[PDB]
Design a protein around this ligand. Structure first.
Ligand SMILES: [Mg+2]
Ligand SMILES: [Zn+2]
Lengths: 195, 130
């Protein structure tokens, strides 16, 4: 579903599919794709992977699709008056204000939050990883009801195909940065301004 | 009632648990009405977020249980939650339960005084992922 659509962003020869891009503007609400695509080329997106033992660079990017790394998708501040945004795809969480503003109205007594923001999993195809939730087999995130550009941008990178992640994070046109972290102090430092 | 039970866990000291006492009000209660049980007093949520983060990246599980006592106080929860409070509360919930995913430790939230209904709703949502 979502994954199969967005997977086509990058051709088999690692080229950006301009036809698909043009269609994605018309296929998503709230200008979500132009917003997400601006983030992808901003150079502010980072994926910090906890790497106590040095790993091959390819093993890092590949581990994001097939392994179980402890990683931290973060959007860097763009100005002095800014704090990092962190995403937790597996929990469909984002520390940005839009995420919290969307959920707030749905906080009522005696109502699952997921009932107001998530969708059932039955209809969805087996190979569509987009919005898949760790733990919850029967529910998936519903991008129509809740999705900011940060979640969209990172889901595009991490819930489509390794080819998509390699395209935005390697080569000359690299605007996304996957970096292994080998020290606890550097890992803690990443979070110091999130709150 | 929950508070007293938490006090009892603290006094007995048998369990491998970490208690986070949040806020001046919660600190006073602990002192006024009171080793495998760690107790830590924090008057800023930044501290709790950083410590949960550290617990996640540490290689070995150290505690079977993590108790967070006083979240309402440090959020400044009075009346219904605003967007900023939902953000902070969700960051704490997601980080706390990330420790459970990493190391398989129980995560419990105890309220000092009356618990906030909306914070209870947010906690229930994150627990579904564990
Ligand atoms: Mg573990
Ligand atoms: Zn966001």
């Amino acid at each position: 579903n979502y994954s199969k659509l967005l997977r086509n962003l990058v051709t088999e020869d690692n080229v950006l599919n301009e036809v698909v891009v043009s269609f994605l503007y018309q296929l998503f609400p709230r200008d979500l794709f132009v917003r997400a695509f601006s983030l992808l080329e901003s150079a502010d997106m980072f994926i910090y992977v906890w790497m106590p033992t040095p790993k091959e660079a390819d093993e890092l990017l590949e581990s994001l699709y097939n392994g179980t790394p402890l990683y931290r998708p973060i959007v860097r501040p763009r100005g002095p008056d800014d704090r990092p945004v962190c995403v937790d795809l597996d929990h469909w969480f984002c520390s940005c204000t839009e995420f919290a503003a969307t959920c707030r109205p749905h906080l009522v007594g005696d109502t699952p939050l997921s009932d107001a923001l998530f969708r059932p999993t039955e209809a969805a195809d087996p190979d569509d990883c987009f919005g898949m939730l760790a733990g919850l087999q029967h529910l998936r995130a519903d991008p129509e009801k809740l999705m900011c550009e940060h979640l969209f941008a990172f889901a595009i990178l991490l819930q489509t195909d390794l080819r998509v992640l390699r395209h935005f994070s390697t080569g000359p046109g690299a605007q996304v940065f996957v970096l292994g972290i080998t020290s606890i102090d550097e890992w803690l430092k990443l979070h110091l301004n999130v709150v | 009632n929950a508070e007293r039970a938490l006090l009892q866990l603290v006094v007995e000291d048998d369990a491998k648990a970490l208690v986070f006492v949040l806020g001046q009000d919660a600190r006073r209660y602990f002192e006024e009405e009171l080793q495998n049980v760690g107790v830590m007093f924090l008057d800023k949520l930044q501290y709790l977020y950083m410590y949960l983060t550290k617990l996640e990246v540490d290689e070995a599980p150290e505690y079977r249980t993590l108790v967070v006592y006083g979240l309402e106080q440090l959020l400044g929860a009075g009346g219904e939650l605003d967007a900023d409070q939902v953000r902070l509360a969700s960051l704490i919930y997601n980080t706390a339960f990330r420790v459970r995913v990493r190391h398989g430790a129980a995560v419990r939230f105890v309220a000092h005084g009356a618990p906030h209904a909306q914070l209870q709703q947010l906690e229930a949502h994150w627990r579904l992922f564990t």
